[PDB]
């Protein structure tokens, strides 16, 4: 067979792991190192540069908060915990740091579609789409203050086409979450921050369903706030709101709403060994059982989806992260309402500790379960017969 290898990034490894998520690139797992560096590490479960000089110590010498790689380049945007937006390229080995506008700890950092800007934010509510150039500098463009609110959840759902020049502008659906006052708002990189929605309940996770245009927000009551940019209202208002079947009621703490396929929504909880998939294909909910090991009960700590290649990560309390094979919406074989048996059990692997931070790689073989013990590189190595 071809058996998974449990090989772990260590040496100076921290918690936040950054994959070159674009396929076809040298998928260098950047690792937010504890001694104020970001470890640009390889994919064999080893540090690529254990000396950690090409792995870049912070110019301002702070701990990292967010590392995200360019969708069209091996450019790594490092959000350090001072506002230090650090653009570093793997092909250039140049880290260029600008901290003119951003001064608080980088809270929201999401790459744009083309990587021409970068939705940057901090705890001041200052969301700022700093432009990204091939001239390799993070340069601030637009400024939006949300005082009393933190830019916590910021998804890229529907890029609104303004009539300014009909340009496809990334419009960041950021939540002005002023202490659970989930003021989800949409800001564009030119001049404006419009309000997406005003829910009283805070955003548990800012999921977006693109097939039927549903900003699948979860309120902090396990309520799937199905926000659709309605044909009758225009913005992502709560068209429907039903309770998740995983941790029914007030169980949003530990609730795991990741993705589960093209027309399937993932739902699970830290009190549930059953992992129910809100299958949007034919409106299905169906459990996926887990195990208990002499009191080491495996209940879902983290769900994450390889939406590039349709695999669901199921992190558990015991530490293992087994995998769920989402069989396609069955138009090829056995058209079924219950995909619980179709959601095939995959060979489990023990990455180590409980899955707290998680980041799927560009391929569903190369991946990190960025647990706190080590930056758990997930990979496969062949065994010849």
mmCIF file of C-alpha atoms in Angstrom:
data_model
loop_
_atom_site.group_PDB
_atom_site.id
_atom_site.type_symbol
_atom_site.label_atom_id
_atom_site.label_comp_id
_atom_site.label_asym_id
_atom_site.label_seq_id
_atom_site.Cartn_x
_atom_site.Cartn_y
_atom_site.Cartn_z
ATOM 1 C CA UNK A 1 0.000 0.000 0.000
ATOM 2 C CA UNK A 2 0.777 3.721 0.263
ATOM 3 C CA UNK A 3 0.666 4.561 3.970
ATOM 4 C CA UNK A 4 0.560 8.032 5.540
ATOM 5 C CA UNK A 5 3.754 9.225 7.217
ATOM 6 C CA UNK A 6 3.369 11.021 10.554
ATOM 7 C CA UNK A 7 6.335 13.380 10.183
ATOM 8 C CA UNK A 8 6.258 16.618 12.148
ATOM 9 C CA UNK A 9 7.679 20.081 11.565
ATOM 10 C CA UNK A 10 9.649 21.057 14.665
ATOM 11 C CA UNK A 11 12.793 22.913 15.731
ATOM 12 C CA UNK A 12 11.202 26.350 16.112
ATOM 13 C CA UNK A 13 7.662 25.559 14.957
ATOM 14 C CA UNK A 14 4.759 27.543 16.358
ATOM 15 C CA UNK A 15 1.022 27.251 15.687
ATOM 16 C CA UNK A 16 -0.032 29.227 12.608
ATOM 17 C CA UNK A 17 0.880 27.341 9.432
ATOM 18 C CA UNK A 18 0.844 28.794 5.937
ATOM 19 C CA UNK A 19 0.570 26.625 2.831
ATOM 20 C CA UNK A 20 1.253 27.782 -0.680
ATOM 21 C CA UNK A 21 -2.392 26.935 -1.335
ATOM 22 C CA UNK A 22 -2.204 27.457 -5.098
ATOM 23 C CA UNK A 23 -1.507 24.074 -6.747
ATOM 24 C CA UNK A 24 1.536 23.639 -8.951
ATOM 25 C CA UNK A 25 3.792 25.791 -6.736
ATOM 26 C CA UNK A 26 6.536 24.719 -4.320
ATOM 27 C CA UNK A 27 4.143 24.232 -1.433
ATOM 28 C CA UNK A 28 6.312 25.749 1.292
ATOM 29 C CA UNK A 29 4.578 25.429 4.653
ATOM 30 C CA UNK A 30 5.306 28.754 6.301
ATOM 31 C CA UNK A 31 5.282 28.321 10.072
ATOM 32 C CA UNK A 32 4.751 31.195 12.502
ATOM 33 C CA UNK A 33 7.827 30.558 14.645
ATOM 34 C CA UNK A 34 7.897 31.450 18.320
ATOM 35 C CA UNK A 35 11.271 33.353 18.144
ATOM 36 C CA UNK A 36 9.621 36.169 16.123
ATOM 37 C CA UNK A 37 10.157 34.480 12.750
ATOM 38 C CA UNK A 38 8.047 32.735 10.128
ATOM 39 C CA UNK A 39 9.462 29.342 9.240
ATOM 40 C CA UNK A 40 9.262 28.837 5.490
ATOM 41 C CA UNK A 41 9.347 25.072 5.809
ATOM 42 C CA UNK A 42 9.178 22.205 3.347
ATOM 43 C CA UNK A 43 6.536 19.520 2.863
ATOM 44 C CA UNK A 44 8.369 16.385 4.069
ATOM 45 C CA UNK A 45 7.616 17.203 7.700
ATOM 46 C CA UNK A 46 11.003 18.888 8.100
ATOM 47 C CA UNK A 47 12.156 22.509 8.344
ATOM 48 C CA UNK A 48 13.262 23.698 4.909
ATOM 49 C CA UNK A 49 15.598 26.291 6.464
ATOM 50 C CA UNK A 50 16.250 25.174 10.068
ATOM 51 C CA UNK A 51 18.695 28.071 10.516
ATOM 52 C CA UNK A 52 15.626 30.312 10.013
ATOM 53 C CA UNK A 53 17.144 33.254 8.168
ATOM 54 C CA UNK A 54 15.459 32.759 4.817
ATOM 55 C CA UNK A 55 12.679 32.057 7.274
ATOM 56 C CA UNK A 56 12.303 35.682 8.152
ATOM 57 C CA UNK A 57 12.545 37.119 11.616
ATOM 58 C CA UNK A 58 10.178 40.051 11.991
ATOM 59 C CA UNK A 59 11.622 43.424 11.034
ATOM 60 C CA UNK A 60 9.910 44.889 14.104
ATOM 61 C CA UNK A 61 10.572 41.745 16.162
ATOM 62 C CA UNK A 62 7.043 40.680 17.163
ATOM 63 C CA UNK A 63 5.210 37.355 17.177
ATOM 64 C CA UNK A 64 3.264 36.437 14.043
ATOM 65 C CA UNK A 65 -0.552 36.385 13.902
ATOM 66 C CA UNK A 66 -1.504 35.522 10.294
ATOM 67 C CA UNK A 67 0.468 34.082 7.387
ATOM 68 C CA UNK A 68 -1.200 33.593 4.012
ATOM 69 C CA UNK A 69 0.386 32.799 0.659
ATOM 70 C CA UNK A 70 -0.379 34.504 -2.637
ATOM 71 C CA UNK A 71 -3.108 32.814 -4.725
ATOM 72 C CA UNK A 72 -1.043 33.457 -7.884
ATOM 73 C CA UNK A 73 2.524 33.583 -6.520
ATOM 74 C CA UNK A 74 4.740 32.174 -3.777
ATOM 75 C CA UNK A 75 4.308 35.532 -2.051
ATOM 76 C CA UNK A 76 3.639 35.135 1.662
ATOM 77 C CA UNK A 77 1.812 37.953 3.415
ATOM 78 C CA UNK A 78 2.798 37.939 7.088
ATOM 79 C CA UNK A 79 0.575 39.777 9.514
ATOM 80 C CA UNK A 80 2.710 40.199 12.582
ATOM 81 C CA UNK A 81 1.177 41.253 15.919
ATOM 82 C CA UNK A 82 2.024 44.938 15.466
ATOM 83 C CA UNK A 83 0.452 45.882 12.126
ATOM 84 C CA UNK A 84 3.618 44.744 10.335
ATOM 85 C CA UNK A 85 2.289 43.600 6.968
ATOM 86 C CA UNK A 86 5.224 41.642 5.572
ATOM 87 C CA UNK A 87 5.211 40.660 1.908
ATOM 88 C CA UNK A 88 7.739 37.884 1.385
ATOM 89 C CA UNK A 89 8.268 35.942 -1.834
ATOM 90 C CA UNK A 90 9.688 32.433 -1.977
ATOM 91 C CA UNK A 91 11.130 33.088 -5.441
ATOM 92 C CA UNK A 92 12.724 36.360 -4.279
ATOM 93 C CA UNK A 93 13.581 35.689 -0.593
ATOM 94 C CA UNK A 94 12.787 39.364 0.025
ATOM 95 C CA UNK A 95 10.577 40.411 2.923
ATOM 96 C CA UNK A 96 9.371 44.008 2.641
ATOM 97 C CA UNK A 97 7.496 45.401 5.626
ATOM 98 C CA UNK A 98 5.222 48.450 5.714
ATOM 99 C CA UNK A 99 3.469 49.643 8.877
ATOM 100 C CA UNK A 100 2.318 53.150 7.951
ATOM 101 C CA UNK A 101 -1.447 52.780 8.352
ATOM 102 C CA UNK A 102 -1.766 49.494 10.247
ATOM 103 C CA UNK A 103 -0.490 49.762 13.822
ATOM 104 C CA UNK A 104 -2.461 47.243 15.920
ATOM 105 C CA UNK A 105 -2.146 43.456 15.799
ATOM 106 C CA UNK A 106 -3.189 42.153 12.379
ATOM 107 C CA UNK A 107 -6.572 40.488 12.924
ATOM 108 C CA UNK A 108 -8.065 40.032 9.440
ATOM 109 C CA UNK A 109 -5.774 39.196 6.517
ATOM 110 C CA UNK A 110 -7.353 37.561 3.467
ATOM 111 C CA UNK A 111 -5.765 37.492 0.026
ATOM 112 C CA UNK A 112 -7.751 38.845 -2.907
ATOM 113 C CA UNK A 113 -8.688 36.848 -6.003
ATOM 114 C CA UNK A 114 -5.885 38.164 -8.232
ATOM 115 C CA UNK A 115 -3.543 39.083 -5.381
ATOM 116 C CA UNK A 116 -3.542 42.750 -6.399
ATOM 117 C CA UNK A 117 -4.658 43.904 -2.942
ATOM 118 C CA UNK A 118 -4.796 42.391 0.543
ATOM 119 C CA UNK A 119 -7.769 42.788 2.883
ATOM 120 C CA UNK A 120 -5.896 43.850 6.007
ATOM 121 C CA UNK A 121 -7.369 44.670 9.382
ATOM 122 C CA UNK A 122 -6.666 44.925 13.079
ATOM 123 C CA UNK A 123 -8.562 45.136 16.363
ATOM 124 C CA UNK A 124 -9.286 48.857 15.881
ATOM 125 C CA UNK A 125 -11.848 48.066 13.197
ATOM 126 C CA UNK A 126 -9.427 49.602 10.681
ATOM 127 C CA UNK A 127 -10.012 47.409 7.651
ATOM 128 C CA UNK A 128 -7.704 48.434 4.826
ATOM 129 C CA UNK A 129 -7.229 46.742 1.458
ATOM 130 C CA UNK A 130 -3.525 47.416 1.062
ATOM 131 C CA UNK A 131 -2.528 46.948 -2.558
ATOM 132 C CA UNK A 132 -0.153 44.186 -3.625
ATOM 133 C CA UNK A 133 2.270 44.891 -6.447
ATOM 134 C CA UNK A 134 4.775 42.917 -8.449
ATOM 135 C CA UNK A 135 6.977 45.779 -7.221
ATOM 136 C CA UNK A 136 6.710 43.749 -4.012
ATOM 137 C CA UNK A 137 5.503 46.252 -1.370
ATOM 138 C CA UNK A 138 2.374 46.343 0.835
ATOM 139 C CA UNK A 139 0.965 49.802 0.116
ATOM 140 C CA UNK A 140 -2.179 51.064 1.833
ATOM 141 C CA UNK A 141 -4.980 52.259 -0.456
ATOM 142 C CA UNK A 142 -8.275 52.724 1.395
ATOM 143 C CA UNK A 143 -9.144 53.194 5.062
ATOM 144 C CA UNK A 144 -12.317 52.180 6.908
ATOM 145 C CA UNK A 145 -12.601 52.642 10.663
ATOM 146 C CA UNK A 146 -14.935 50.429 12.707
ATOM 147 C CA UNK A 147 -14.252 51.662 16.252
ATOM 148 C CA UNK A 148 -15.470 49.496 19.098
ATOM 149 C CA UNK A 149 -15.617 46.583 16.641
ATOM 150 C CA UNK A 150 -13.036 43.999 15.598
ATOM 151 C CA UNK A 151 -12.621 42.803 12.021
ATOM 152 C CA UNK A 152 -12.941 39.125 12.941
ATOM 153 C CA UNK A 153 -14.846 37.357 10.153
ATOM 154 C CA UNK A 154 -14.133 38.610 6.623
ATOM 155 C CA UNK A 155 -15.222 36.380 3.734
ATOM 156 C CA UNK A 156 -14.963 36.902 -0.020
ATOM 157 C CA UNK A 157 -18.421 35.965 -1.269
ATOM 158 C CA UNK A 158 -20.053 37.931 -4.078
ATOM 159 C CA UNK A 159 -17.692 40.610 -5.438
ATOM 160 C CA UNK A 160 -20.117 43.466 -6.025
ATOM 161 C CA UNK A 161 -19.742 45.092 -9.442
ATOM 162 C CA UNK A 162 -19.908 48.819 -8.800
ATOM 163 C CA UNK A 163 -21.074 51.082 -11.641
ATOM 164 C CA UNK A 164 -17.905 53.175 -11.256
ATOM 165 C CA UNK A 165 -16.207 51.375 -14.155
ATOM 166 C CA UNK A 166 -17.904 47.932 -13.876
ATOM 167 C CA UNK A 167 -14.675 46.600 -12.382
ATOM 168 C CA UNK A 168 -14.688 43.250 -10.600
ATOM 169 C CA UNK A 169 -13.729 44.564 -7.157
ATOM 170 C CA UNK A 170 -13.254 42.250 -4.200
ATOM 171 C CA UNK A 171 -15.824 43.390 -1.645
ATOM 172 C CA UNK A 172 -14.862 42.152 1.811
ATOM 173 C CA UNK A 173 -17.878 41.006 3.841
ATOM 174 C CA UNK A 174 -16.285 41.941 7.148
ATOM 175 C CA UNK A 175 -18.152 41.684 10.432
ATOM 176 C CA UNK A 176 -17.976 44.825 12.566
ATOM 177 C CA UNK A 177 -18.460 42.471 15.507
ATOM 178 C CA UNK A 178 -18.645 45.055 18.286
ATOM 179 C CA UNK A 179 -18.776 42.563 21.182
ATOM 180 C CA UNK A 180 -21.119 40.015 19.538
ATOM 181 C CA UNK A 181 -22.997 42.845 17.766
ATOM 182 C CA UNK A 182 -22.368 41.173 14.413
ATOM 183 C CA UNK A 183 -22.543 44.160 12.099
ATOM 184 C CA UNK A 184 -21.528 42.307 8.958
ATOM 185 C CA UNK A 185 -20.501 44.946 6.432
ATOM 186 C CA UNK A 186 -19.209 44.979 2.865
ATOM 187 C CA UNK A 187 -16.249 47.210 2.011
ATOM 188 C CA UNK A 188 -14.617 47.849 -1.346
ATOM 189 C CA UNK A 189 -11.035 48.887 -1.977
ATOM 190 C CA UNK A 190 -11.980 52.314 -3.397
ATOM 191 C CA UNK A 191 -14.191 54.337 -1.065
ATOM 192 C CA UNK A 192 -17.063 52.592 0.696
ATOM 193 C CA UNK A 193 -18.196 50.245 3.471
ATOM 194 C CA UNK A 194 -21.816 49.207 3.066
ATOM 195 C CA UNK A 195 -23.644 47.095 5.626
ATOM 196 C CA UNK A 196 -24.276 43.460 4.729
ATOM 197 C CA UNK A 197 -26.648 42.700 7.616
ATOM 198 C CA UNK A 198 -27.349 43.590 11.259
ATOM 199 C CA UNK A 199 -27.771 40.408 13.291
ATOM 200 C CA UNK A 200 -27.911 40.657 17.066
ATOM 201 C CA UNK A 201 -26.259 37.245 17.420
ATOM 202 C CA UNK A 202 -22.532 37.160 16.789
ATOM 203 C CA UNK A 203 -21.022 35.420 13.786
ATOM 204 C CA UNK A 204 -19.983 31.931 14.894
ATOM 205 C CA UNK A 205 -18.437 31.323 11.470
ATOM 206 C CA UNK A 206 -18.820 33.256 8.219
ATOM 207 C CA UNK A 207 -19.602 30.459 5.766
ATOM 208 C CA UNK A 208 -20.826 31.358 2.271
ATOM 209 C CA UNK A 209 -22.773 29.050 -0.044
ATOM 210 C CA UNK A 210 -21.958 30.132 -3.622
ATOM 211 C CA UNK A 211 -24.229 27.719 -5.520
ATOM 212 C CA UNK A 212 -27.432 29.386 -4.279
ATOM 213 C CA UNK A 213 -25.797 32.649 -3.072
ATOM 214 C CA UNK A 214 -26.245 31.972 0.647
ATOM 215 C CA UNK A 215 -23.899 33.687 3.079
ATOM 216 C CA UNK A 216 -24.272 30.764 5.488
ATOM 217 C CA UNK A 217 -23.571 32.690 8.674
ATOM 218 C CA UNK A 218 -23.949 30.824 11.945
ATOM 219 C CA UNK A 219 -25.232 32.902 14.807
ATOM 220 C CA UNK A 220 -24.063 32.117 18.314
ATOM 221 C CA UNK A 221 -27.067 29.835 18.877
ATOM 222 C CA UNK A 222 -26.287 27.127 16.260
ATOM 223 C CA UNK A 223 -28.647 29.026 13.942
ATOM 224 C CA UNK A 224 -27.621 28.837 10.297
ATOM 225 C CA UNK A 225 -28.419 32.408 9.282
ATOM 226 C CA UNK A 226 -28.905 31.663 5.599
ATOM 227 C CA UNK A 227 -28.097 35.141 4.328
ATOM 228 C CA UNK A 228 -28.925 35.480 0.650
ATOM 229 C CA UNK A 229 -28.429 38.632 -1.378
ATOM 230 C CA UNK A 230 -32.142 38.483 -1.994
ATOM 231 C CA UNK A 231 -33.909 39.450 -5.199
ATOM 232 C CA UNK A 232 -36.432 41.268 -2.971
ATOM 233 C CA UNK A 233 -34.007 43.130 -0.686
ATOM 234 C CA UNK A 234 -30.570 43.227 -2.313
ATOM 235 C CA UNK A 235 -28.148 42.437 0.519
ATOM 236 C CA UNK A 236 -27.421 39.298 2.541
ATOM 237 C CA UNK A 237 -30.441 39.384 4.823
ATOM 238 C CA UNK A 238 -31.548 36.311 6.759
ATOM 239 C CA UNK A 239 -33.766 34.560 4.214
ATOM 240 C CA UNK A 240 -34.008 31.448 6.396
ATOM 241 C CA UNK A 241 -32.642 30.445 9.787
ATOM 242 C CA UNK A 242 -32.792 26.824 10.936
ATOM 243 C CA UNK A 243 -31.014 25.151 13.828
ATOM 244 C CA UNK A 244 -28.072 22.869 13.153
ATOM 245 C CA UNK A 245 -28.709 19.227 13.980
ATOM 246 C CA UNK A 246 -25.198 19.027 15.496
ATOM 247 C CA UNK A 247 -25.408 20.359 19.035
ATOM 248 C CA UNK A 248 -29.031 21.467 18.815
ATOM 249 C CA UNK A 249 -29.683 24.652 20.769
ATOM 250 C CA UNK A 250 -27.002 26.795 22.411
ATOM 251 C CA UNK A 251 -23.962 24.739 21.419
ATOM 252 C CA UNK A 252 -22.133 27.126 19.075
ATOM 253 C CA UNK A 253 -19.082 26.825 21.336
ATOM 254 C CA UNK A 254 -17.518 23.758 19.741
ATOM 255 C CA UNK A 255 -19.828 23.780 16.719
ATOM 256 C CA UNK A 256 -17.927 23.072 13.499
ATOM 257 C CA UNK A 257 -19.526 24.502 10.369
ATOM 258 C CA UNK A 258 -17.017 23.883 7.594
ATOM 259 C CA UNK A 259 -17.811 22.928 4.027
ATOM 260 C CA UNK A 260 -18.756 19.478 2.820
ATOM 261 C CA UNK A 261 -18.974 19.642 -0.971
ATOM 262 C CA UNK A 262 -20.562 21.458 -3.872
ATOM 263 C CA UNK A 263 -24.064 20.949 -2.441
ATOM 264 C CA UNK A 264 -23.267 19.689 1.054
ATOM 265 C CA UNK A 265 -22.635 21.746 4.199
ATOM 266 C CA UNK A 266 -20.564 20.397 7.078
ATOM 267 C CA UNK A 267 -21.776 20.518 10.669
ATOM 268 C CA UNK A 268 -20.364 18.914 13.814
ATOM 269 C CA UNK A 269 -19.715 19.640 17.472
ATOM 270 C CA UNK A 270 -17.251 18.878 20.261
ATOM 271 C CA UNK A 271 -20.019 16.991 22.084
ATOM 272 C CA UNK A 272 -20.922 14.937 18.992
ATOM 273 C CA UNK A 273 -19.252 11.805 17.692
ATOM 274 C CA UNK A 274 -21.854 12.039 14.903
ATOM 275 C CA UNK A 275 -20.849 14.358 12.072
ATOM 276 C CA UNK A 276 -23.965 15.504 10.221
ATOM 277 C CA UNK A 277 -23.659 16.905 6.706
ATOM 278 C CA UNK A 278 -26.254 19.505 5.690
ATOM 279 C CA UNK A 279 -26.432 18.180 2.137
ATOM 280 C CA UNK A 280 -27.774 21.052 0.036
ATOM 281 C CA UNK A 281 -28.125 18.718 -2.978
ATOM 282 C CA UNK A 282 -31.417 17.202 -1.783
ATOM 283 C CA UNK A 283 -31.722 18.837 1.696
ATOM 284 C CA UNK A 284 -30.261 15.976 3.713
ATOM 285 C CA UNK A 285 -28.884 15.598 7.221
ATOM 286 C CA UNK A 286 -27.074 12.373 8.042
ATOM 287 C CA UNK A 287 -24.756 11.355 10.857
ATOM 288 C CA UNK A 288 -21.158 10.144 10.599
ATOM 289 C CA UNK A 289 -20.148 8.194 13.690
ATOM 290 C CA UNK A 290 -16.862 8.513 15.579
ATOM 291 C CA UNK A 291 -15.209 6.376 18.249
ATOM 292 C CA UNK A 292 -14.430 6.286 21.964
ATOM 293 C CA UNK A 293 -11.131 4.866 23.268
ATOM 294 C CA UNK A 294 -11.359 3.881 26.968
ATOM 295 C CA UNK A 295 -12.600 7.356 27.870
ATOM 296 C CA UNK A 296 -10.640 9.132 25.114
ATOM 297 C CA UNK A 297 -13.825 10.001 23.255
ATOM 298 C CA UNK A 298 -13.235 11.275 19.716
ATOM 299 C CA UNK A 299 -15.592 14.227 19.260
ATOM 300 C CA UNK A 300 -15.251 16.750 16.468
ATOM 301 C CA UNK A 301 -13.010 19.630 17.505
ATOM 302 C CA UNK A 302 -12.292 21.101 14.070
ATOM 303 C CA UNK A 303 -13.878 20.592 10.684
ATOM 304 C CA UNK A 304 -12.107 21.945 7.634
ATOM 305 C CA UNK A 305 -12.727 21.171 3.984
ATOM 306 C CA UNK A 306 -10.360 20.734 1.071
ATOM 307 C CA UNK A 307 -12.884 22.463 -1.170
ATOM 308 C CA UNK A 308 -10.282 22.263 -3.944
ATOM 309 C CA UNK A 309 -10.529 18.459 -3.864
ATOM 310 C CA UNK A 310 -13.522 17.531 -1.624
ATOM 311 C CA UNK A 311 -12.166 16.056 1.605
ATOM 312 C CA UNK A 312 -13.300 16.950 5.126
ATOM 313 C CA UNK A 313 -10.876 17.112 8.054
ATOM 314 C CA UNK A 314 -12.374 15.840 11.315
ATOM 315 C CA UNK A 315 -10.169 16.820 14.236
ATOM 316 C CA UNK A 316 -11.025 15.066 17.481
ATOM 317 C CA UNK A 317 -10.481 15.516 21.205
ATOM 318 C CA UNK A 318 -8.200 12.472 21.419
ATOM 319 C CA UNK A 319 -5.871 14.019 18.845
ATOM 320 C CA UNK A 320 -6.420 11.997 15.690
ATOM 321 C CA UNK A 321 -7.771 13.633 12.529
ATOM 322 C CA UNK A 322 -9.454 11.001 10.375
ATOM 323 C CA UNK A 323 -10.858 11.901 6.986
ATOM 324 C CA UNK A 324 -14.281 11.842 5.360
ATOM 325 C CA UNK A 325 -14.574 11.050 1.644
ATOM 326 C CA UNK A 326 -17.437 13.129 0.251
ATOM 327 C CA UNK A 327 -18.880 10.997 -2.517
ATOM 328 C CA UNK A 328 -20.288 13.204 -5.256
ATOM 329 C CA UNK A 329 -23.958 14.289 -5.395
ATOM 330 C CA UNK A 330 -25.011 10.957 -6.732
ATOM 331 C CA UNK A 331 -25.810 11.468 -10.403
ATOM 332 C CA UNK A 332 -23.248 8.827 -11.459
ATOM 333 C CA UNK A 333 -23.910 5.817 -9.196
ATOM 334 C CA UNK A 334 -26.636 5.037 -6.601
ATOM 335 C CA UNK A 335 -28.722 8.263 -6.428
ATOM 336 C CA UNK A 336 -29.377 8.400 -2.709
ATOM 337 C CA UNK A 337 -30.783 10.704 -0.051
ATOM 338 C CA UNK A 338 -28.536 9.274 2.696
ATOM 339 C CA UNK A 339 -24.875 9.950 1.945
ATOM 340 C CA UNK A 340 -23.779 8.646 5.369
ATOM 341 C CA UNK A 341 -22.541 5.417 3.813
ATOM 342 C CA UNK A 342 -21.463 7.398 0.743
ATOM 343 C CA UNK A 343 -19.343 9.585 3.023
ATOM 344 C CA UNK A 344 -16.719 6.849 3.126
ATOM 345 C CA UNK A 345 -14.443 6.327 6.111
ATOM 346 C CA UNK A 346 -10.824 7.090 5.186
ATOM 347 C CA UNK A 347 -7.624 5.696 6.765
ATOM 348 C CA UNK A 348 -7.149 7.608 10.005
ATOM 349 C CA UNK A 349 -3.822 9.108 10.986
ATOM 350 C CA UNK A 350 -2.484 10.422 14.284
ATOM 351 C CA UNK A 351 -1.095 13.884 13.578
ATOM 352 C CA UNK A 352 -0.520 14.317 17.308
ATOM 353 C CA UNK A 353 -2.425 16.696 19.557
ATOM 354 C CA UNK A 354 -5.988 18.008 19.238
ATOM 355 C CA UNK A 355 -6.718 19.816 15.967
ATOM 356 C CA UNK A 356 -6.951 23.488 16.964
ATOM 357 C CA UNK A 357 -5.505 25.334 13.958
ATOM 358 C CA UNK A 358 -6.091 23.770 10.571
ATOM 359 C CA UNK A 359 -5.077 24.482 6.987
ATOM 360 C CA UNK A 360 -5.636 22.243 3.981
ATOM 361 C CA UNK A 361 -2.884 22.231 1.392
ATOM 362 C CA UNK A 362 -3.132 22.675 -2.380
ATOM 363 C CA UNK A 363 -3.626 18.903 -2.813
ATOM 364 C CA UNK A 364 -5.562 16.376 -0.703
ATOM 365 C CA UNK A 365 -2.378 14.484 0.145
ATOM 366 C CA UNK A 366 -0.189 17.398 1.231
ATOM 367 C CA UNK A 367 -1.684 19.290 4.132
ATOM 368 C CA UNK A 368 -1.116 20.439 7.713
ATOM 369 C CA UNK A 369 -3.138 19.830 10.845
ATOM 370 C CA UNK A 370 -1.478 22.803 12.536
ATOM 371 C CA UNK A 371 -1.839 21.543 16.083
ATOM 372 C CA UNK A 372 -0.110 23.154 19.044
ATOM 373 C CA UNK A 373 2.410 20.332 19.571
ATOM 374 C CA UNK A 374 3.928 20.570 16.085
ATOM 375 C CA UNK A 375 3.116 21.797 12.592
ATOM 376 C CA UNK A 376 1.810 18.379 11.582
ATOM 377 C CA UNK A 377 2.693 17.922 7.917
ATOM 378 C CA UNK A 378 0.241 15.467 6.386
ATOM 379 C CA UNK A 379 1.747 13.499 3.514
ATOM 380 C CA UNK A 380 1.950 10.020 2.018
ATOM 381 C CA UNK A 381 5.020 7.903 1.278
ATOM 382 C CA UNK A 382 4.941 4.796 -0.899
ATOM 383 C CA UNK A 383 5.633 1.225 0.230
ATOM 384 C CA UNK A 384 6.724 -1.038 -2.616
ATOM 385 C CA UNK A 385 5.226 -4.501 -3.104
#
